[model samples]
Target: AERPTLPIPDLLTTDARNRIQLTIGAGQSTFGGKTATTWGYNGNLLGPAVKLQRGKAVTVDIYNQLTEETTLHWHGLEVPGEVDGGPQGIIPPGGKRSVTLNVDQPAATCWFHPHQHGKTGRQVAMGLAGLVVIEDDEILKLMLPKQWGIDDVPVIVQDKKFSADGQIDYQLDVMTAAVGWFGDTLLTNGAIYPQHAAPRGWLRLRLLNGCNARSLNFATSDNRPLYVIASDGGLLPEPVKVSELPVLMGERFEVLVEVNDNKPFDLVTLPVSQMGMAIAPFDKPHPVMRIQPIAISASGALPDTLSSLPALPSLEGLTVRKLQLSMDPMLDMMGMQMLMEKYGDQAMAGMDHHMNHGGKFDFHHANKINGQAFDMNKPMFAAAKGQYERWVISGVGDMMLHPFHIHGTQFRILSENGKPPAAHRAGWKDTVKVEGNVSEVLVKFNHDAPKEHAYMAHSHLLEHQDTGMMLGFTVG
Candidate 1:
């Protein structure tokens, strides 16, 4: 199926007040001559893309129109804790709240989604999410693809589950809670088999893995490598081309690729699917979608140089804090079994049983960070203003990958297995994926009004986070 052009919401001025009505409910759709049940944003699956500029102040009046309560967290943005919109802030049933956010960070690609504790996975899976792009004069001047809904694209790539009748089935069982939910059908911009017409030229693609848990290995149809221009934040120091890129849930990537005019090409990714039993099922992969280009346009000068990013702060004389992530079933085997029964074989199908903190195992029923669950009222770590610290994070469980995210500030990956960090990681980063074992990151808190701000560090996996895998830190 062809990918669809991402829907862009009306652009908001720096002082514009936007009111959004978000709901969670069951809906119906027809695919392949069969009727199915589903969930969506605003009305049906997925919400529209929101556009904003840097250093703008905007007020969003959010109305939670769903039967259940939910909170919206702006991922990757360094907003004050009051507007962070995670578990502590809830939009009760038929209730609403106004959030005033000032975009003071660098130009970047961020997102907003339901962040309710213990239910974020289910709520987000029901299509309560959207994308936000913070622009700046520097990025606007680049001769990159800028067509809002045509050549330029906002790809909200996600995997979803459909009921027997062809509608989205919203449910979670033990397996889902343990491992994570993997969807059977894939959707781009809320459309099934969506397609787009692109002019022959270098096109900019902003790609986001909005799936609950699915990780994608992305590539071009002709197997050509993509020139990755930016990651979660805006432009990288320089372009880095890779044959394939692995994107975990809640992560974003921007790539510039030259498309052939008047020909069909694909911006494709191989998703883990149930096909080809000859190979390991988990290793088996299939194409997620295709891209077709149908025109030729004049090529603009791609920027040879992007914004100059600040170098990662030195780690000299910095205190190192170590965090370990692990899961134990003994604490709540009943809950695990219930989740397993609810999700069936689709959840945690190949996940490892035991998880660790750093390297030790303190068996607790739920997932834990440093042997404790998240407590919003309690601050885990306190830092002085303008202090640099290196945080070391490791995955103790078997083969589980966690997208570790920190709020209020961006950090730099110091090392993966004590090796040098990647070139793309030398700049600011709000989230980093820790795979298998232990990895370390370096960050410095710089809020001048530290007493008025607090930070959150947690797994970007909505499910794990909801089940008590987050920690809060304050800088004073």
Candidate 2:
């Protein structure tokens, strides 16, 4: 089968007055030579690449054309909770809403997706997501490739499960709801077996692990050096060269792959063993996309330094908050026992375990933070503006990996398991991978968030977030 050319999403830049419009609609997408139903913003599959400027205030007018309500959450942009679009900002079927973004953050590759409480997992899986690229004066002056699609490209990678007839499947059993949902097929920019043509130059691959629960082990077929220049929130002080990089769900990394001559290179995924169980497909390596090199005269040199990040503030007297990623192993056993006894194991052939069976138990109830589920009306805590606070996130009980993400601010990781972080992690980040160990971070909020509009903190795994592993906090 011929590989489909990788689609570069149209860049929607803010006008001279710093304004843009986004419309959400339903569409049909072809994957694996079959058509399936999907959704997007301003397009058929995914949304456009929204280009924003640093320190510039942009008003985005969003219109919902679909029949269902949806909220667009800026994944890594540092904005006030009022326009953060967490679950509170809902645009009804035909409703319109406008959000003004006072972009103060540095240059980074952020993303946006539907974050409507329980429907986030489904909407995102249905292809409702886009990339948000923030630019600043300093980065613009650097000797780097700033082009949209020629030298630099966006690779929004997501995992999807297709039915026998090629329709997108969103079904979840009790174990999947409790643990996490892993897909069988992988999509690069909403297409399968895609290929991108690149000039013989420094190809900046902005890799975004947009999977619901699967973690991506990014690598190259030739084992070439992946010069990581930036992280989820902003550029690192320097590029860290590595053979393979592990990107969890909702995490982004900008790496420069040197394209010598016109020879082709394959960008693939190495085997990831982070997941607790031995899931065959996810635990094995698979080809993500191919980069066919085109003839060009000059391939630029890799920069020695990317950006200078500020030193983290001292945490001597800052408040420390401890959080536990909670999931009771006994709950899974008990739920299975109840189902077996009630339905005699044979009648449960077609049961939807995501829902409650006669109010016996809710599959989502077992996954929580600090033993409490998410409540929009209730705020777990409050943070004072412009004050640094330390948060300790620990994994509890036979833990798998959980990518913990915080809204409204980009934080610095202090330590992971009482040890200094790796060189690649020494940058501003909004999400950190937490496994069977402790990860500490220093966070501060620069915007005000009232009780009605609160910032969220939760696991980046879509199902874990939708099914109770999240909390809201206010900033004053």
Candidate 3:
């Protein structure tokens, strides 16, 4: 049977680009013949696509309709810290919160997600994510794919495992929580296993890894070079060709490819051997989506130059800090065994936690930053209100790939592994994948985050995040 076509979210219209309405609610869906409970934005699964233009001031009205509290985080947009949707932005049940932002940033594929304390993994696994496309003058005029629901497609890839009853089984435990949850099933835009169809033209895929812990190796089945156009922040200097890119949780990339042939080509996940076996547990491969050629309706020339990036800021004489990502790998392939040792069959009940104190998480013994799990009562570090700095983020020994993300501001990748980033990764970025090497970035904050409510810089792996892999710091 043919798979379900990907759902395109509806765009909201206003008298001016001032206010957009977002209602957070609960619903149910029957997938694989199982009716499971889910959470979404303004709908029954996933959410709608929200579009905004740079230089426009907009306000987002969010209504929390779920039984519990949740927060909507603007993942890649450069909004103020007050509205960046960090841990302190939670909206109570049946309550509403509004945030006005001056969309001052480059054109990029940003996203909104629930960042509510410890409930993030299950909430997202239950389906609560959406896309935010920012349109600037240059991006609108570029000769690239921009046709919505057609050539320009939003690709949100995720993984999940359902029980025999068709319900999502969030396999969390002491061992699994250390490495993060990895699902045994694959899904693309909420659809089960299937191939996609596209017209004979240039296709631009807005890739976002919405998975909790799984990392993706996006490569074509025929092993053709994927023309990399943009990264997390925005367009690169130009299109650089690569066989595959490691798309990790909370990271984004825009890639262009030509569908000149009529035969179907699979977008498969090939392994990235660079991420050693410590990262092996989550390196399972499967097709997230496919494209079969069709009659051409829209076509665009793949421009030789896509963007002119800003020059990098000097990191000399700036505050420098080294962050070490350390984890425990004891539960490798032994999640069931470790969980059974802890709570027997009641292990699931312990991790089924919808509303509980996260620091009280007794699942894993180790997931730390520099040597400590997240302590909300303490601030890990401090930066001046507007001071620029450098962070040499590194992993200790052999390890799994951790996608690092910082709230409240976007940074430029100065170097990765002591070298400049590739043409595709050499732009403004809020998150970067750290495998076995080190990465240096130039970062700065625009506002102050007091000790009461500070910003966070942590691994985007939600499972790792919930169990102490994150750290908090005051922006001031």
Candidate 4:
């Protein structure tokens, strides 16, 4: 059966709400000198932004037009399992699925993309993604900077590789199955050289690091401090001032910058520093995107209070689970050889091969909660409804820095390596970075689960999840 052709709708506006149709299709673009085949969403690469108001019922009709099956997953929303769009919620090649979500959460930045079991990295890399905004009355009433599409903008930063034909290339192989493939070319909202217009006051920039494996060291070209207002889930208790932030893949950060007398400031994402490593390559620093002030406007003042954050639940008398991430390079090497023999030399194309959580090759097979991989029928640890649990995540892999993520419910970091985490992290978190050889995070679950809501815990790196570093747990 041929896949249905997804449609791309124009910039839609409905009162305080907006709707945009996204189609997954193959498009042609000039790469070097010839036209190359590449996949795109509404426009050329990333889809358009869909904005809606809080308390409104949001309806997104996702039509699967690809040859293979696909599903749209809301990354940070507190939606139900069926609507959450996991592996089990796939839409047939020619079918369509409509997601109706009530915007009950606070005003924050969120995103959506394909959630196929093992193809998430490839599909997202090839496009088929977009940004969604949830605005609230309280936020709108604030004196904070509120310039839409101009001073305030949504930046989707990603990296990509082009084939000899100049088309976006995705080749799955052993190395890709382990370390994840990184593109040589950097793109912003699908454009190689993207630009944004900002007012000469304070500009709120919502940034999403949509790259596959790259961890961006985000900073201003002038090295000025950025006021961070929110993270993945929502706003922080107090604004954090930082000169540079290491935003990992799949992470989001909302920054409020005072574009005082903006002549033309550059938002730069410095390349990973080599720090005089003997074998590491030192890549030159380049601008992620340029911000040009078009108009001079009065500086806006931000409110002292952003949002009401939930308190961390207690872990007393609740079920406890521990997960250890280990690695075996020998097994990973053998698996790579097997993949090459089975899929030919191109087998490793668009694949990552680093094995964590004990060399398993189910793609989604990382280590399990109790030394088990993902089993839909089998629960990692089942708890009673409304019961809390203390989950301790420890890293044993050779590489450091594991961005631990949880699904369905948000947790509070109780402690790290026997010491309490920062005051800001004591609030709520869906993902936390666990440093190598000297990091551990303790979290307590607070959401209710009744057998139907099985949550996932794994590395936030999309490639890691695709190559075997994810696990799931259920409570009833």
Q: What overall lDDT goes with each candidate model?
A: 0.67, 0.82, 0.76, 0.62
Alpha carbon deviation, residue 262, candidate 4 (Å): 5.6
Question: Candidate 2, 362: how far from true, in Å?
Answer: 1.0
Clashes of 4: 24
- The lDDT ranking, best first, is 2, 3, 1, 4
- Estimate the overall C-alpha local distance difference test score of candidate 1: 0.67
Q: Across residues 1-476, which tens digit of lDDT does each residue of candidate 3 receive? A: 67776656676544465688899998887777788877789988888778888888788899999989888888988765577787778899999999887877789888899987766777888889998888789987787887787788888888776788878788556555755665666678777655566778788888888988766779887776788888888888788899888777888898987786667787877644421212323344567777777776557657888888777666678989888887754443354455457544433331212345464444443567888877777879887667778888886563555788988777888876557876677787888767667888888787777776678788888877776778888875
Query: What's the TM-score of each model vs. the native?
Result: 0.85, 0.93, 0.88, 0.81
RMSD of each: 5.1, 4.6, 5.5, 7.0
Q: Indicate which candidate wins on TM-score.
A: 2
Candidate 1 has a TM-score of 0.85
Better of 3 and 4 by TM-score: 3
The digit string of per-residue lDDT tens for model 1 on 132-176 reads 888877887777777766666777877677777566665555455
Which residue ranges in model 2 land beyond 4 Å of their true spot?
A: 276-280, 333-360
Q: Which 10 residues in a row give candidate 2 its minimum summed lDDT?
A: 345-354
By TM-score rank, best first, the candidates go: 2, 3, 1, 4
Error of model 4, residue 250, in angstroms: 1.1
